[PDB]
Amino acid sequence: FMFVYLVFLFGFSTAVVTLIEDGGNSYNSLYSTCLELFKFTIGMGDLEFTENYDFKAVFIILLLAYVILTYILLLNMLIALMGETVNKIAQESKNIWKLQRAITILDTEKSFLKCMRKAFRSGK
Amino acid sequence: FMFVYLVFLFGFSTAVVTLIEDGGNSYNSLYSTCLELFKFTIGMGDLEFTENYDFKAVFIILLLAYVILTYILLLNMLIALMGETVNKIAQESKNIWKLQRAITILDTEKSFLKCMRKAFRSGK
């Protein structure tokens, strides 16, 4: 998810910062544009966070395309994939937890062997 | 999803901009109202973004109806449909990927035929 997300974010951030001319709040920075476009993902994205562009239609089209492609498409697809994965591994997780607890039991027994090596023996 | 979404958005934006009289921040524009109503979708919508209306009850009723119909209903329905689609095509996507890789192999082999037409032959 993060590989795909970062590909999209970097592509659109490079496009946006290329469009901006900074002539402003020094928004003509790759880091600042990347952060401002990432805010869109967490429901805090300002659609007009700058006005240092010669063409407003291009800027708004790029922002809307990014929003629809990541905020609406990628994130909901991730929700769907997480749901599918939860169903697939409903029973496998139980087995993994059992193995983890078994390893815990073995480690605890081996550590406590010093205090009582054969005192705690199973079965009669 | 976008056809339905745009039908709803345009209907309610036309209604809202018709209600507004701009007598303000020149909010009596179709583009501005469309953008302000689209912000509701990305979790950045101001419920009172203007006060140039003669009837406040009508304005707030329209905004609440739009919010409930798009933000709560349409988007969650899209989430559900994406989940259902992910389940349906869990196995088909694998076959499509295999076909894509096969086409890649054929294209690469045909391109490399010039360097060595028969040197890279399969089987003995």
Ligand code: NA
């Ligand atoms: Na949100």
Ligand code: NA
């Ligand atoms: Na928010």
